[PDB]
């Protein structure tokens, strides 16, 4: 009635006030500042290694901490741990649910995490005494499909699901110590800060939210994309992040002045982005489109500097090492490739 | 070979054994049939599932062939984000119970359950990831349909229909209005079947349809196509 109308109205002018406040803090654009610096040249990168052995579509890969090992996930029902130098196969792990969407590698190197389309997140122990890799934990409690997972340390993990929720979990405890709610559409991705204090998540309602691990609260909400958000990640400096979407566009968002930084889009591209990642200095941004090939843009000038065209199907996952030594791309043709 | 230490050769050996186990594992996965199950709710989906025997799974064997059914009823998520995971399945099985036109779903007294089932079949049949995928349409709970139809002609849900209100003409009309929804007609085939809750054939029907799909796939592999 009158109370409902007045409270909905009040919500409306508060949304208007927040919009006016982020408009009122802008006085310049990134491109105007950055157009002067000399552009990097053509980034000619060749396939120095080709990892083969998956028999189906690949959705997830994650680099190791030393910048020599990595892990990958496919619909075959297998997780695989690789040796990037000698192209050896270090580990091969089965799964109980073939329908996986994400995997992650512990920052120490003792555990890995896998999950998707089952409402679970499983934790496996690599460096065991017994010689094998075995399941340590079955985190349960979401009501949608699990879209992403990241290790905070050896005991804390943060998950985002399709039922519009994010959560923080304590692997030893086996239960959620914080739930982050407020997305209307399905949440598709999340990325952790360099120092593990804040994390961003992006969802199907064309928006992203910044969260406080300790406070379990939505500090900022970011909008501007016309469609879904497929992938997200921080800048290495920890004060910006990059969003990949389903309307053939990539975007950069700041945290301190929560605005739009830059947009990366070309008219010849009309397909969807599946992954983004950053460089060691944050000078190059890698985007994996599903026009079968990857693009390497200037993360500072919104130009195009190179292409990684060696795949014969949809490019799903993508990653960069901790030192900058290589990049790795996976795809729906079941082949992983290392570029230098 | 000549540059590798005594410890590197053992690592190469381990990687090779992992390779052979991956290859052996991925071949047994290609001797099984993938069927994706859809329906409008209590459309007899559960009853066909109990007839043949998170995301739910079912496994069965019949005359030396292994079938897998992937039931996605309870996902309740945005379907466009998880549907392409089934892009390469063998068949779709779509269940609708044909005595469910007078009784309307709790959502609406006016928009009937048949209109919702029509929306579902239309949306699935023209999906971009299923342009070469065959569909098996089960029409369930037939015996009750005569009791429900003799009290009121199909005009409630089929006002533009004219018939003496016997089971044969009514059910046949319903089937027509179902298979006319296809928009491929050249790279897709639809197999329709009328059955009650209990049966002694719903299993042979799927065997036949999948045998047909397999033989066509083989002939396409030849190039004799």
């Amino acid at each position: 009635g009158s109370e409902l109308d007045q409270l909905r109205q009040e919500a409306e002018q508060l949304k208007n006030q927040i919009r006016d406040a982020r408009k009122a803090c802008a006085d310049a654009t990134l491109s105007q500042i950055t157009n002067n610096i000399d552009p990097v040249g053509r980034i000619q990168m060749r396939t120095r290694r080709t990892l083969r052995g998956h028999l189906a579509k690949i959705y997830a890969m994650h680099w190791g901490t030393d910048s020599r090992l990595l892990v990958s996930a496919s619909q075959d029902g297998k997780l695989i741990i690789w040796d990037s130098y000698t192209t050896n196969k270090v580990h091969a792990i089965p799964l109980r649910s073939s329908w996986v969407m994400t995997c992650a590698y512990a920052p120490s190197g003792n555990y890995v995490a896998c999950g998707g389309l089952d409402n679970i997140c499983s934790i496996y122990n690599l460096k065991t005494r017994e010689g094998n890799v075995r399941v340590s934990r079955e985190l349960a409690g979401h009501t949608g499909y699990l879209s992403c997972c990241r290790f905070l340390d050896d005991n804390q993990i943060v998950t985002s699901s399709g039922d519009t929720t994010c959560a923080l979990w304590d692997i030893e405890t086996g239960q959620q110590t914080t739930t982050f709610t407020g997305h209307t559409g399905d949440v598709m991705s999340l990325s952790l800060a360099p120092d593990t204090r804040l994390f961003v998540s992006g969802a199907c309602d064309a928006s992203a939210k910044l969260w406080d691990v300790r406070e379990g609260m939505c500090r900022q909400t970011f909008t501007g994309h016309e469609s879904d958000i497929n992938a997200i990640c921080f800048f290495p400096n920890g004060n910006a992040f990059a969003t990949g979407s389903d309307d053939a566009t990539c975007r950069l968002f700041d945290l301190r002045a929560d605005q739009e930084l830059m947009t990366y889009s070309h008219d010849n591209i009309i397909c969807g982005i599946t992954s983004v990642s950053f460089s060691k200095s944050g000078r190059l941004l890698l985007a994996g489109y599903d026009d079968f090939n990857c693009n390497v843009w200037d993360a500072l000038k919104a130009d195009r500097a190179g292409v990684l065209a060696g795949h014969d199907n949809r490019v799903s996952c993508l990653g960069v090492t901790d030192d900058g030594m290589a990049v790795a791309t996976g795809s729906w043709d079941s082949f992983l490739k290392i570029w230098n | 070979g000549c540059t590798l230490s005594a410890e590197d050769k053992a690592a190469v050996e381990r990687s090779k054994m992992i390779d052979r186990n991956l290859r052996e594992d991925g071949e047994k996965a290609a001797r099984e049939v993938k069927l994706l199950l859809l329906g409008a709710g209590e459309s007899g989906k559960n009853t066909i599932v109990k007839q043949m025997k998170g995301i739910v799974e079912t496994h069965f064997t019949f005359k030396d062939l292994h079938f897998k059914m992937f039931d996605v009823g309870a996902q309740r998520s945005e379907r466009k984000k998880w549907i392409h995971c089934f892009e390469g399945v063998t068949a779709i099985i779509f269940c609708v119970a044909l005595s469910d036109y007078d009784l309307v779903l709790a959502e609406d007294e006016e928009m009937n359950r048949m209109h919702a089932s029509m929306k579902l079949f239309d949306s699935i049949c023209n999906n971009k990831w299923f342009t070469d995928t065959s569909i098996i349409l089960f029409l369930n709970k037939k015996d009750l349909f005569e009791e429900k139809i003799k009290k009121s002609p199909l005009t409630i849900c089929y006002p533009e229909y004219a018939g003496s209100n016997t089971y044969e003409e009514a059910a046949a009309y319903i089937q027509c209005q179902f298979e006319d929804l296809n928009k491929r007609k050249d790279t897709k085939e639809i197999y329709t079947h009328f059955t009650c809750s209990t049966d002694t054939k719903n299993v042979q029907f799927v065997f036949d349809a999948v045998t047909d799909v397999i033989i066509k796939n083989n002939l396409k592999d030849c190039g004799l196509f």
Partner: single-chain antibody
């Protein structure tokens, strides 16, 4: 985890004998197996190697064609078979497990071995010192040398340090001449360069006394040094 080994005894010089270890508590079918021999009041010597999948087999140059190793993964049991036993085959035998992949720690668990008595080029590693007296509470150092450079081109340095406390079996202390095995205190360390290396201990403890050994693993055969005893 454990590798209970059996098969020893006294043997006439002309005769056959088998030595079988049973592995319980781990994935035995993913572990290269070795036999390493030690002589009474002497050092120890490598014997033989069989890898994961029965692909590569290696024998010591002094045992060729007269020893035979064998594996059984369905029941996790490994054998060695002997037919010609000269008087210098009286020793004890320790069966060691190891696994090879990037970051692995070979020669990790050791077992207990069995004692067999008999009726009466290669890199060289030598431990010049035979006994360093010391009282608890200060630094101790032991030095080992090789006939050439053990730093392989790939970057590794296949030198191992390991200990035998008086009255029991050995256990790994340092693998690849710098890295510390799991389950031992940080009292121990190992440094070196080229062909000269030193094991070192900072704080001595009543459990730290033992006989210390160095090994290289660059190529075959695997060659030890002498046994450097410590006394209180």
């Amino acid at each position: 985890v454990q590798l209970v080994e059996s098969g020893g005894g006294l043997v006439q010089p002309g005769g056959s004998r088998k030595l079988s270890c049973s592995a319980s508590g781990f994935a035995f079918s993913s572990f290269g197996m070795h036999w390493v021999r030690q002589a009474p009041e002497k050092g120890l010597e490598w014997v033989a190697y069989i890898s994961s999948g029965s692909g590569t087999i290696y024998y010591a140059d002094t045992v060729k064609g007269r020893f035979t190793i064998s594996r059984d993964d369905p029941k996790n049991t490994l054998f060695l078979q002997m037919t010609s036993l000269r008087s210098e085959d009286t020793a004890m035998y320790y069966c060691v497990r190891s696994i090879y992949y990037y970051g692995s720690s070979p020669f990790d668990f050791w077992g207990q071995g069995t004692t067999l008595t008999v009726s009466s080029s290669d890199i060289v590693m030598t431990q010049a010192t035979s006994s360093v007296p010391v009282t608890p509470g200060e630094s101790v150092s032991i030095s080992c040398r090789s006939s050439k450079s053990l730093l392989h081109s790939n970057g590794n340095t296949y030198l191992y340090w390991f200990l035998q406390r008086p009255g029991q079996s050995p256990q790994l202390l340092i693998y690849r001449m710098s890295n510390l095995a799991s389950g031992v205190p940080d009292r121990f360390s190992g440094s070196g360069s080229g062909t000269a290396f030193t094991l070192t201990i900072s704080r001595l403890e009543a459990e730290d006394v033992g006989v210390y050994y160095c090994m290289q693993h660059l190529e075959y055969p695997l060659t030890f040094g002498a046994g450097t005893k410590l006394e209180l």
